[PDB]
Design a binder for this molecule. Sequence first.
Ligand SMILES: *[C@@H]1O[C@H](CO)[C@@H](O[C@H]2O[C@H](CO)[C@@H](O[C@@H]3O[C@H](CO[C@@H]4O[C@H](CO[C@@H]5O[C@H](CO)[C@@H](O)[C@H](O)[C@@H]5O)[C@@H](O)[C@H](O)[C@@H]4O)[C@@H](O)[C@H](O)[C@@H]3O)[C@H](O)[C@H]2NC(C)=O)[C@H](O)[C@H]1NC(C)=O
Ligand SMILES: *[C@@H]1O[C@H](CO)[C@@H](O[C@H]2O[C@H](CO)[C@@H](O[C@@H]3O[C@H](CO[C@H]4O[C@H](CO[C@@H]5O[C@H](CO)[C@@H](O)[C@H](O)[C@@H]5O)[C@@H](O)[C@H](O)[C@@H]4O)[C@@H](O)[C@H](O)[C@@H]3O)[C@H](O)[C@H]2NC(C)=O)[C@H](O)[C@H]1NC(C)=O
Ligand SMILES: *[C@@H]1O[C@H](CO)[C@@H](O[C@@H]2O[C@H](CO)[C@@H](O[C@@H]3O[C@H](CO[C@@H]4O[C@H](CO)[C@@H](O)[C@H](O)[C@@H]4O)[C@@H](O)[C@H](O)[C@@H]3O)[C@H](O)[C@H]2NC(C)=O)[C@H](O)[C@H]1NC(C)=O
Ligand SMILES: *[C@@H]1O[C@H](CO)[C@@H](O[C@@H]2O[C@H](CO)[C@@H](O[C@H]3O[C@H](CO[C@@H]4O[C@H](CO)[C@@H](O)[C@H](O)[C@@H]4O)[C@@H](O)[C@H](O)[C@@H]3O)[C@H](O)[C@H]2NC(C)=O)[C@H](O)[C@H]1NC(C)=O
Ligand code: MNH
Ligand code: MNH
Ligand SMILES: *[C@@H]1O[C@H](CO)[C@@H](O[C@H]2O[C@H](CO)[C@@H](O)[C@H](O)[C@H]2NC(C)=O)[C@H](O)[C@H]1NC(C)=O
Ligand SMILES: *[C@@H]1O[C@H](CO)[C@@H](O[C@H]2O[C@H](CO)[C@@H](O)[C@H](O)[C@H]2NC(C)=O)[C@H](O)[C@H]1NC(C)=O
Ligand SMILES: CCCCCCCCO[C@@H]1O[C@H](CO)[C@@H](O)[C@H](O)[C@H]1O
Ligand SMILES: CCCCCCCCO[C@@H]1O[C@H](CO)[C@@H](O)[C@H](O)[C@H]1O
Ligand SMILES: CCCCCCCCO[C@@H]1O[C@H](CO)[C@@H](O)[C@H](O)[C@H]1O
Ligand SMILES: CCCCCCCCO[C@@H]1O[C@H](CO)[C@@H](O)[C@H](O)[C@H]1O
Ligand SMILES: CCCCCCCCO[C@@H]1O[C@H](CO)[C@@H](O)[C@H](O)[C@H]1O
Ligand SMILES: CCCCCCCCO[C@@H]1O[C@H](CO)[C@@H](O)[C@H](O)[C@H]1O
Ligand SMILES: CCCCCCCCO[C@@H]1O[C@H](CO)[C@@H](O)[C@H](O)[C@H]1O
Ligand SMILES: C[C@H](C(=O)O)c1ccc(-c2ccccc2)c(F)c1
Ligand SMILES: C[C@H](C(=O)O)c1ccc(-c2ccccc2)c(F)c1
Lengths: 553, 553
Amino acid sequence: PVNPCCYYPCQHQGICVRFGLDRYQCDCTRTGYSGPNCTIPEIWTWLRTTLRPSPSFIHFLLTHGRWLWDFVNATFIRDTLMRLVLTVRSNLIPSPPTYNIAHDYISWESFSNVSYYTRILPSVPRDCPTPMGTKGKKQLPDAEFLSRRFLLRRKFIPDPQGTNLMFAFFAQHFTHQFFKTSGKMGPGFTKALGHGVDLGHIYGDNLERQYQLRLFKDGKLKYQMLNGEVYPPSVEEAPVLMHYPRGIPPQSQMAVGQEVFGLLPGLMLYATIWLREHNRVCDLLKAEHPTWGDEQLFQTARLILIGETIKIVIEEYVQQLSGYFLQLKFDPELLFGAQFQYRNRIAMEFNQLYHWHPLMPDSFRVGPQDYSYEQFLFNTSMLVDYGVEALVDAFSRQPAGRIGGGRNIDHHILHVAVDVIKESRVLRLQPFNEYRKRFGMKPYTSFQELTGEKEMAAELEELYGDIDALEFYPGLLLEKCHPNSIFGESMIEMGAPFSLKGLLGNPICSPEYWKASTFGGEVGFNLVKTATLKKLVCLNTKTCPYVSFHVPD
Amino acid sequence: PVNPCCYYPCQHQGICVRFGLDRYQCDCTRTGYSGPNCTIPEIWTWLRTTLRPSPSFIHFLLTHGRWLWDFVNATFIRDTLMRLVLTVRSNLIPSPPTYNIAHDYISWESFSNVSYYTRILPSVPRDCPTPMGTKGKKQLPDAEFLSRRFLLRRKFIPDPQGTNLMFAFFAQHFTHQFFKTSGKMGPGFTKALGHGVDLGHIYGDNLERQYQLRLFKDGKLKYQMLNGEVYPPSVEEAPVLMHYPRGIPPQSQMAVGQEVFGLLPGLMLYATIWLREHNRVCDLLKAEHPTWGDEQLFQTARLILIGETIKIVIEEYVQQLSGYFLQLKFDPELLFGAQFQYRNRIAMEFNQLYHWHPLMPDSFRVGPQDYSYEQFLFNTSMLVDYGVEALVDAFSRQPAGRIGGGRNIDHHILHVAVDVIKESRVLRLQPFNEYRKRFGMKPYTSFQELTGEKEMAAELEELYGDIDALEFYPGLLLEKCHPNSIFGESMIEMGAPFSLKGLLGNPICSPEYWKASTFGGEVGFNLVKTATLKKLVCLNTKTCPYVSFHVPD
Ligand SMILES: *[C@@H]1O[C@H](CO)[C@@H](O[C@H]2O[C@H](CO)[C@@H](O[C@@H]3O[C@H](CO[C@@H]4O[C@H](CO[C@@H]5O[C@H](CO)[C@@H](O)[C@H](O)[C@@H]5O)[C@@H](O)[C@H](O)[C@@H]4O)[C@@H](O)[C@H](O)[C@@H]3O)[C@H](O)[C@H]2NC(C)=O)[C@H](O)[C@H]1NC(C)=O
Ligand SMILES: *[C@@H]1O[C@H](CO)[C@@H](O[C@H]2O[C@H](CO)[C@@H](O[C@@H]3O[C@H](CO[C@H]4O[C@H](CO[C@@H]5O[C@H](CO)[C@@H](O)[C@H](O)[C@@H]5O)[C@@H](O)[C@H](O)[C@@H]4O)[C@@H](O)[C@H](O)[C@@H]3O)[C@H](O)[C@H]2NC(C)=O)[C@H](O)[C@H]1NC(C)=O
Ligand SMILES: *[C@@H]1O[C@H](CO)[C@@H](O[C@@H]2O[C@H](CO)[C@@H](O[C@@H]3O[C@H](CO[C@@H]4O[C@H](CO)[C@@H](O)[C@H](O)[C@@H]4O)[C@@H](O)[C@H](O)[C@@H]3O)[C@H](O)[C@H]2NC(C)=O)[C@H](O)[C@H]1NC(C)=O
Ligand SMILES: *[C@@H]1O[C@H](CO)[C@@H](O[C@@H]2O[C@H](CO)[C@@H](O[C@H]3O[C@H](CO[C@@H]4O[C@H](CO)[C@@H](O)[C@H](O)[C@@H]4O)[C@@H](O)[C@H](O)[C@@H]3O)[C@H](O)[C@H]2NC(C)=O)[C@H](O)[C@H]1NC(C)=O
Ligand code: MNH
Ligand code: MNH
Ligand SMILES: *[C@@H]1O[C@H](CO)[C@@H](O[C@H]2O[C@H](CO)[C@@H](O)[C@H](O)[C@H]2NC(C)=O)[C@H](O)[C@H]1NC(C)=O
Ligand SMILES: *[C@@H]1O[C@H](CO)[C@@H](O[C@H]2O[C@H](CO)[C@@H](O)[C@H](O)[C@H]2NC(C)=O)[C@H](O)[C@H]1NC(C)=O
Ligand SMILES: CCCCCCCCO[C@@H]1O[C@H](CO)[C@@H](O)[C@H](O)[C@H]1O
Ligand SMILES: CCCCCCCCO[C@@H]1O[C@H](CO)[C@@H](O)[C@H](O)[C@H]1O
Ligand SMILES: CCCCCCCCO[C@@H]1O[C@H](CO)[C@@H](O)[C@H](O)[C@H]1O
Ligand SMILES: CCCCCCCCO[C@@H]1O[C@H](CO)[C@@H](O)[C@H](O)[C@H]1O
Ligand SMILES: CCCCCCCCO[C@@H]1O[C@H](CO)[C@@H](O)[C@H](O)[C@H]1O
Ligand SMILES: CCCCCCCCO[C@@H]1O[C@H](CO)[C@@H](O)[C@H](O)[C@H]1O
Ligand SMILES: CCCCCCCCO[C@@H]1O[C@H](CO)[C@@H](O)[C@H](O)[C@H]1O
Ligand SMILES: C[C@H](C(=O)O)c1ccc(-c2ccccc2)c(F)c1
Ligand SMILES: C[C@H](C(=O)O)c1ccc(-c2ccccc2)c(F)c1
């Protein structure tokens, strides 16, 4: 008796449940559809899907007609559209969360145990005929071969949207606060229990670590002075676990919230900027509240930095990534009149989707000097040698690589993609086409439709045998990009829901928290409301360099 | 300089914040008022409070005109009113939670660390002139004296609403799943991390314990047979820590989710009933899903019992307690059109308010036998000696004591009340009158108004010196009771918000979870929708005894 749920019979978010020895039933509750397979639409459902323009057409609208968008951005329409974007995208993410690596069904354990990443679609049942369900071959393509053939960079392909390394390192720094897969527990488990923008990559993911990083004076974080500049303290002064190669003296190791940030100067650079910002805010708070103790100063500054982070991510980071002419806006009040849960649980699919390694260049240019990967990775003196401004200027000027399209991952880090594919099979992620449907898109009917070309498509078809066997991550990276864009429609249609839900799902965005008193008053509240990448850097450096998520002109 | 917030200047939920060396500012955001102290109403705010009838009047309407209610209860008006009750009561509880014993302000730590109970009103600042703020004497009345004088029972006072011991033990059993103050960490901390109806008192508050309790076959819980009846297993078979007097061997201990249930036959009675219900549901589930494994059977049965619990608590437990002619209803769908957060955090005030020791009798009667506290407490054989049916019958027949009114706590357990008062001072809970205002009532202007009499009021005035110095717990237990009611209005006006938010705030009540598939299909969903105290007992016992939360007529 072949498990009927292996055919993914239930459509439009209907839930497949096994009944008896060989039957199945689809729970169509609130899907907007009825029938054995949740395929019979109600009137409003049918109209909505019949009138909704394609993701590609909407993408076109949002990236053309600057004159019209400028006009619209200056009106209430900006708010109307931002609210629509927030609600429509977020609603595709279940909240409270549903499944995890252990339970392909709702359970109290999945709801309460936050050491688990959640998941949007249940796993491919273990008893299915093929690894992907019922389609494809008995054995999936070799992960290594797949990576060498379709993901390995031949010649660097710059991002057409002008994205730079300042952006690339921000993305890596930012995402590493909520993606922290546990080596000890295995795939499907995380150590970032905050499951969102808690800034645990600055303050630590646990209390004792936070306490080791804190000065416990004026609400500040410990630090050290080098060349008259402020930097994170060494592991000697802040006895915290850091992942550095054996053989590196403790005095040369910097201690920050995230244990892996010693890996790249680009990561430690952001750790330095944010640490400086935290202490700068502590100073502003104390001037306003001389009676406050160290604890309240520390806690309030953290809330302010969380807000500054979400503000910058929405209005500058996502703005650069989307390429939209619509001026995005971070305003929690846009959701006060809607039904929305202020909670977030990080999905394993979101983790996979965010492996944007193609962004990394062939080498790292700092002024007239060109640094190789061996001169960059784990280099513990470069940040201090050049200082914050110099590195920000260089990273802001160097272009990052295009993410989608294929063949654009530097050989130095290709092994990461190989492991992502291997872990996807351990997590038993459903095929790319099933995720397409889950996020409102039609499944691809062939590999040529996916790639937009013929040679790679033919080889993929040979390897996978069926488009319905194509895996999640490979599909995301091999999909044809939007015209002159950094990646394809799926990265946007699937990634936007996860990202936006994770930003606005934060408790500081709730009516209960979003008030001036939460941030120590008007001064703190305005810091959040007017935060900018430029101010983040320049209010914390001697001089102000070129700073942006876009390469200069 | 005297801390200005010691005067509780900000009204209507405005937040008091210290500015400069001696100033304060009230954050009136979304309170519906403006002005230095949030006292100037907006037009709609003024209308709402002017047309709003008093709690006493509303109570009258709900306990009179049975003929009218009988009509209402059979129409959709029942739903309209239940939704109104749910939303208006729940809106008084902040969500996400705000403060805790360490932070009298919003912070990421308060939001994320669930080992802390939350609190609704901040503590009395440690630097205030008097223990309660600015009113009263420099020293509060001795806790032991206060208890002896006003809380000690002199003559048993039965509850005029007919509440029985079956109800009392349900209340004790039920609340002990979310009130588990940590002896190690101290006041302000809890071990019940589920913060609500997770049934941790049946399955254990931690995974390791749950695993020792589970059979790992058919999704069931371990059990043992005695006199042909099913009971919880022994600690020898289920190696779990249970709090029993030293000298009682593991083979003679019963292992259940909550460590302290061996203390009373009444507690183990419910532990036994729910254990039998769990395994019963597993049988029903397996019949429907023969392909399911032990894990899914166990998790699904747990979800069903959670739903059954909420159903019985709202429609029978709270119904009995309220004495309303309005037929309360548990229907999550009532809130699907409203803005509501599906989460809960247990408040320290809710813990205090739920110390209903007056309910306990002078002795426990089982048929012709009358057992004393010395014979009842920690009795290791009574449950098995009599069996479930006999104890349910006896407890359903014996009257429980009136909660409010004062002087009704049996001397055997008066020490608990003494400790509650002492814990209250450690927690630095604000005065009863501040809580009255926080929950929408006018503060009492004198002790005579509070008690409704002259004798106790006169002595209370002498001891406290000022009505605004009266503490939270004593205030709840000494306030005059509603006509022929089990307690006063404050217990209802303050208790209803916490209780209802805790019941509906459960994730199973969310649109995401409230579906047939969550409970294994229609059979499981109906078990929840039709749950009853009588069925809970009789579908798990040989014979059907008198079972109710009210003594027989
Ligand atoms: C979140 O969710 C994750 C995933 O579930 C949790 O992972 C960890 O917790 C699990 C439970 O502790 C770990 O499971 C392992 O199970 C092994 C097998 O043990 C079996 O259970 C008992 C063992 O007890 C037996 O009897 C006596 C009684 O006193 C006992 O002393 C003795 O040890 C004896 O074995 C028994 O019925 C069986 O025969 C088995 O022994 C354990 O050996 C192992 O130590 C562990 O407990 C799981 O491995 C943990 N780690 C991971 C990554 O899975 C995580 O804890 C959850 N987080 C939270 C906060 O809840
Ligand atoms: C939820 O919230 C509660 C309440 O905060 C929290 O409670 C528990 O956690 C804290 C922090 O771990 C415990 O702290 C206690 O106090 C001291 C900490 O003082 C330190 O001071 C010195 C600094 O240490 C230096 O750093 C070196 C690093 O290598 C170290 O080796 C040396 O010690 C060195 O001196 C030091 O002198 C001292 O030893 C301490 O490190 C602890 O020692 C003490 O044992 C306590 O842990 C709280 O007590 C603890 N429990 C309570 C009830 O407060 C929970 O953990 C939070 N829960 C979660 C999930 O976050
Ligand atoms: C835990 O609970 C169990 C019950 O489940 C306790 O055991 C029971 O104890 C009672 C009294 O201690 C035993 O009483 C039985 O019936 C009569 C009762 O007394 C009669 O009524 C009054 C009281 O004196 C008098 O007017 C009458 O003349 C008459 O004495 C008693 O006399 C019998 O001898 C008989 O024991 C009951 O039998 C017993 N049940 C069992 C199965 O043991 C147990 O003690 C308790 N543990 C603790 C620590 O107290
Ligand atoms: C960690 O990062 C540090 C950067 O802060 C590294 O250091 C710097 O390393 C560079 C490269 O080795 C070093 O370069 C000096 O010498 C260069 C001479 O080479 C010239 O440029 C071209 C390269 O061959 C030729 O075309 C040209 O003819 C000439 O030969 C010169 O270009 C540089 O400007 C510079 O003078 C820097 O001096 C180092 N700076 C410091 C502060 O020491 C360090 O090596 C990294 N650590 C590790 C282990 O890799
Ligand atoms: C020089 C650049 C660079 C290097 C050496 C690099 C290295 C790694 C290594 C090593 C791993 C872990 C792999 C394993 O197999 O266990 C990993 C994981 C990961 N990395 Mn990348 N990474 C980037 C850039 C780099 N990453 C950029 C740019 C981003 C974009 C946001 C990114 C995002 C991720 C994500 C997301 C993970 C997964 C983290 C987790 O699950 O713990 N990264
Ligand atoms: C026979 C009767 C009986 C006994 C011996 C009993 C005893 C105790 C003891 C001892 C403590 C812990 C006190 C301390 O000072 O630390 C405690 C706590 C508590 N009890 Mn009563 N208790 C009841 C009945 C009893 N309780 C009933 C009935 C209820 C009503 C719902 C109730 C509710 C509470 C609550 C609530 C707590 C606090 C739990 C927590 O903070 O851990 N109960
Ligand atoms: C609903 O989904 C099932 C499962 O894929 C579809 O397939 C079933 O019905 C077909 C129609 O006769 C049979 O030919 C298939 O063998 C059978 N497969 C299984 C797994 O039972 C079914 O057609 C779908 N029905 C609708 C109305 O869409
Ligand atoms: C706001 O609340 C405060 C505190 O209850 C009120 O009290 C302050 O002002 C009074 C007016 O003269 C003084 O008599 C009090 O001593 C003073 N107390 C403090 C906190 O310093 C104040 O009157 C209220 N103001 C308004 C506009 O209602
Ligand atoms: C109501 C007015 C409609 C005008 C039709 C606009 C046509 C836009 O056409 C768009 O062109 C893009 C490429 O440039 C494609 O990628 C989109 O899928 C396609 O819809
Ligand atoms: C209310 C929001 C409306 C957004 C619609 C903006 C879409 C911009 O549409 C633009 O209109 C121009 C007309 O001169 C065309 O020339 C451009 O090709 C087209 O992209
Ligand atoms: C013309 C400008 C319109 C701006 C509104 C865009 C926001 C709607 O975004 C929509 O969200 C859906 C669910 O996530 C997706 O399935 C659609 O493809 C996407 O276009
Ligand atoms: C038509 C609407 C008329 C509204 C009349 C406003 C009445 C509320 O009046 C307010 O009462 C408070 C407490 O007594 C005072 O502290 C405020 O200063 C006062 O403005
Ligand atoms: C009885 C008349 C009641 C009128 C209700 C007042 C509505 C709120 O009116 C507001 O008052 C503010 C203070 O000047 C202005 O700044 C706002 O623009 C205005 O909308
Ligand atoms: C829609 C909800 C309506 C609630 C109103 C219920 C109030 C019951 O009101 C009752 O009406 C009786 C009339 O015969 C009087 O005799 C009772 O004294 C009075 O309490
Ligand atoms: C006549 C029937 C009326 C049913 C509506 C009752 C529900 C409203 O309940 C109200 O909740 C408020 C907030 O907790 C309290 O302050 C009010 O005193 C209370 O009556
Ligand atoms: C605003 C816009 C949209 O909703 O279309 C949009 C586009 C892309 C993202 C996005 C952000 C991070 C990873 C992947 C996708 C996003 F979060 C929002
Ligand atoms: C339905 C009614 C109301 O809201 O008035 C009501 C009355 C009393 C309670 C209540 C339940 C447990 C402890 C304290 C109060 C409750 F939860 C609900």
